[PDB]
Amino acid sequence: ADTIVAVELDTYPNTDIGDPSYPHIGIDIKSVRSKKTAKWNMQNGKVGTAHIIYNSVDKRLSAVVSYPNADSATVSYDVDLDNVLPEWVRVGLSASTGLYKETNTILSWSFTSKLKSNSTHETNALHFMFNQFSKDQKDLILQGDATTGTDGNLELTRVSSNGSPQGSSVGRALFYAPVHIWESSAVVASFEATFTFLIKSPDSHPADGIAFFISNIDSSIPSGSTGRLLGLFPDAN
Amino acid sequence: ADTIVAVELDTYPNTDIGDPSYPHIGIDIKSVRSKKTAKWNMQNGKVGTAHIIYNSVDKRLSAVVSYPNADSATVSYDVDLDNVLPEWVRVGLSASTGLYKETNTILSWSFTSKLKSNSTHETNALHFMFNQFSKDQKDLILQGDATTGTDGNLELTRVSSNGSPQGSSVGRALFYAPVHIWESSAVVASFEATFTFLIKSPDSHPADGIAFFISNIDSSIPSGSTGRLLGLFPDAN
Ligand SMILES: CCN(CC)c1ccc2c(c1)Oc1cc(N(CC)CC)ccc1C2c1ccccc1C(=O)OCCOCCOCCOCCn1cc(CO[C@H]2O[C@H](CO)[C@@H](O)[C@H](O)[C@@H]2O)nn1
Ligand SMILES: CCN(CC)c1ccc2c(c1)Oc1cc(N(CC)CC)ccc1C2c1ccccc1C(=O)OCCOCCOCCOCCn1cc(CO[C@H]2O[C@H](CO)[C@@H](O)[C@H](O)[C@@H]2O)nn1
Ligand SMILES: [Ca+2]
Ligand SMILES: [Ca+2]
Ligand SMILES: [Cl-]
Ligand SMILES: [Mn+2]
Numbered sequence: 001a002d003t004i005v006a007v008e009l010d011t012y013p014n015t016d017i018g019d020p021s022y023p024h025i026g027i028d029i030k031s032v033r034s035k036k037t038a039k040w041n042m043q044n045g046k047v048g049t050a051h052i053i054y055n056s057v058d059k060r061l062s063a064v065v066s067y068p069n070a071d072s073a074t075v076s077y078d079v080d081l082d083n084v085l086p087e088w089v090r091v092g093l094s095a096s097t098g099l100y101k102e103t104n105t106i107l108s109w110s111f112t113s114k115l116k117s118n119s120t121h122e123t124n125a126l127h128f129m130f131n132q133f134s135k136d137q138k139d140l141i142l143q144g145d146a147t148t149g150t151d152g153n154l155e156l157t158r159v160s161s162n163g164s165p166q167g168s169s170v171g172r173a174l175f176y177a178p179v180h181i182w183e184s185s186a187v188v189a190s191f192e193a194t195f196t197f198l199i200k201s202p203d204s205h206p207a208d209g210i211a212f213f214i215s216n217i218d219s220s221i222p223s224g225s226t227g228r229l230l231g232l233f234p235d236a237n
Numbered sequence: 238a239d240t241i242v243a244v245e246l247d248t249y250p251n252t253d254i255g256d257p258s259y260p261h262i263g264i265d266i267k268s269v270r271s272k273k274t275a276k277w278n279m280q281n282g283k284v285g286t287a288h289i290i291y292n293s294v295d296k297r298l299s300a301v302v303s304y305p306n307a308d309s310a311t312v313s314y315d316v317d318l319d320n321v322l323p324e325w326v327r328v329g330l331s332a333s334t335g336l337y338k339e340t341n342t343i344l345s346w347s348f349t350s351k352l353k354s355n356s357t358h359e360t361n362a363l364h365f366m367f368n369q370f371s372k373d374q375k376d377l378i379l380q381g382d383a384t385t386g387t388d389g390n391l392e393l394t395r396v397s398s399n400g401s402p403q404g405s406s407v408g409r410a411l412f413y414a415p416v417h418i419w420e421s422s423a424v425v426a427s428f429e430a431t432f433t434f435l436i437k438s439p440d441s442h443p444a445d446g447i448a449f450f451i452s453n454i455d456s457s458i459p460s461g462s463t464g465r466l467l468g469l470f471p472d473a474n
């Protein structure tokens with residue numbers, strides 16, 4: 001099975017598998033049942049921003065989601081990455097719909113990682129930034145329904161000709177290169193990610209959400225992970 | 238056959254392919270016969286640094302090689318990358334030995350590329366930095382004889398357990414992800430690369446050199462490209 005660390009922007013309450021009763025952001029460590037959540041006043045049709053940060057000094061994974069002129073939703077959690085992930089991983093965005101639906105449109109995505117070994121500036125780093133996406137975005141691995149379209153955006157889940165979202169869709173985008181996120185010789189390991197997103201839904205209840213995730217390098221969309229499993233997990237354990 | 242743009246640090250004069258009669262730096266555009274060169278006072282067994290810069294404003298590819306407390310060697314040449322390379326490329330380092338030999342050790346390597354589209358801050362960027370190479374360096378594609386060591390270095394060509402280099406060796410390391418180096422809607426496409434290198438020879442005569450190159454994404458070492466072809470070119474044309 002894949003190993004997943006994720007921050008979920010969960011638009012649909014699946015109370016029967018642990019979700020609080022409202023849209024929420026959550027920190028997911030090898031399970032769709034979030035280790036920590038916070039209430040998220042999601043806004044239909046508006047562009048939001050997510051920021052995810054980790055450092056190995058405090059060993060705290062944190063995330064904040066916001067819209068311009070609204071209160072932010074924020075969540076933090078203890079995590080030792082040497083403990084949960086392999087040394088080398090890929091990073092990605094995932095989204096899904098199920099019975100209920102929403103656009104899962106990514107307008108920008110940036111990531112930076114740094115791994116300072118043993119010595120006094122002996123730092124390896126990777127940074128990438130996408131402020132638009134091309135039709136052939138060769139440095140992304142697109143999985144499932146994910147496409148990079150005419151608009152210059154990444155559509156994680158299937159969108160019709162008119163821009164209207166489709167149900168029972170799942171897609172991910174992974175950065176092409178593996179990332180060295182820990183090494184036992186590192187004096188400080190750290191990363192950050194940011195992305196801007198447009199979740200819009202004709203439905204009463206949008207579903208199901210978007211996540212930034214870190215996985216084993218050979219991760220793929222697990223079977224039956226559309227809808228509530230957010231393209232990340234094979235089951236709800 | 239591959240499409241190659243390179244900066245060569247050429248330690249061995251092959252004057253029958255237009256090398257000048259001394260070690261030299263050169264700019265190579267689809268041929269081992271450099272479009273331009275400058276004399277380079279190579280220093281056997283000392284750590285040197287190379288810096289390669291390109292912007293699409295001036296459309297000029299420039300390179301400097303130096304050692305601490307020595308004069309530098311510099312070369313520049315007109316290059317429209319859109320006219321030479323595909324939109325997507327890989328970036329790498331190559332070296333070879335032939336009948337004469339040298340260590341072709343890389344101690345660090347960084348690269349940054351930026352592509353500003355149509356719009357006003359519509360920048361995509363990639364940056365990586367290796368100040369130490371690990372034994373399993375998963376974000377490098379190693380070709381031929383190249384290896385990464387538990388000593389933290391990248392040996393592009395074959396070195397024996399006792400430290401002495403081998404003849405008839407060729408090896409390359411390419412960053413794992415494809416790089417978007419130009420786009421027809423770009424206001425500015427630019428990049429820079431730096432590496433530190435250690436070339437040592439027990440011989441009186443070191444050969445053959447190290448190069449930073451940009452290639453078609455599917456580039457591989459041309460058959461028989463040891464010696465003067467620097468692992469870059471299938472022939473001397
Ligand atoms: C919200 C209004 N409700 C509550 C009244 C609702 C909505 C749809 C069905 C519901 C109930 O019940 C059944 C029951 C059955 N049974 C078998 C004959 C008896 C167990 C079969 C189909 C449905 C549907 C349904 C019919 C047609 C097409 C698809 C679905 C569907 O996917 O249901 C979900 C899975 O079914 C199997 C068990 O079902 C109970 C689970 O929990 C029940 C509460 N529930 C279901 C859902 C929507 O779940 C889907 O969409 C979600 C949002 O996109 C995703 O998170 C989720 O993964 C799934 O895709 N939300 N809450
Ligand atoms: C293994 C013992 N060694 C090492 C001690 C060895 C063996 C033979 C030679 C050696 C060295 O050196 C030279 C040097 C010269 N020079 C000019 C007066 C001085 C710059 C001329 C000939 C030789 C020969 C030699 C003599 C007779 C018959 C054939 C060769 C021969 O090199 O054939 C080799 C292949 O050739 C094909 C290319 O053909 C046009 C080249 O133009 C000729 C000028 N030349 C050849 C060389 C060396 O080329 C090899 O080594 C280079 C350095 O590693 C590589 O750049 C090159 O690709 C090739 O591996 N350098 N200049
Ligand atoms: Ca949910
Ligand atoms: Ca030469
Ligand atoms: Cl590729
Ligand atoms: Mn949830």
Ligand SMILES: [Mn+2]
Binds near residue numbers: 247256261271
């Ligand atoms: Mn030359």
